[PDB]
């Protein structure tokens, strides 16, 4: 087991060829790796928005690989967290993709 896994909640959001692009189905399998919760969609505007809701011990590294890593047509012109902070614990049952 482990010592105590701090619960966090954070956002992100993507700026570039991220538009055009069905990198959401792989946003699916990578999501799993660390095993994480949240959804996946994007907005009227021309942007990803990916609630990614897991512990400090993977969503530290989660956000040093989505922001690094990623697909060829998925330029990461931009990439920023929001509404980081600690919460009792996650909201969801798992991952899933919302077109």
Do not use: C
Not at 4 to 22: A, H, M, P, R
Not at 41 to 65: A, C, F, Y
Not at 73 to 97: C, G, M, R, T
């Amino acid at each position: 087991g482990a010592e105590g896994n701090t619960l966090i909640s954070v956002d992100y959001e993507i700026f570039g060829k991220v538009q055009g692009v069905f990198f959401r189905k792989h946003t699916q399998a990578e999501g799993k790796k660390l095993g994480l919760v949240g959804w996946v969609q994007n907005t009227d505007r021309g942007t990803v928005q990916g609630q990614l809701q897991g512990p400090i011990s993977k969503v530290r590294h989660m956000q040093e690989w989505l922001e690094t890593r990623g697909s060829p047509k998925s330029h990461i012109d931009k990439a920023n967290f929001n509404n980081e902070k600690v919460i009792l614990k996650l909201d969801y049952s798992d991952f899933q993709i919302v077109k």
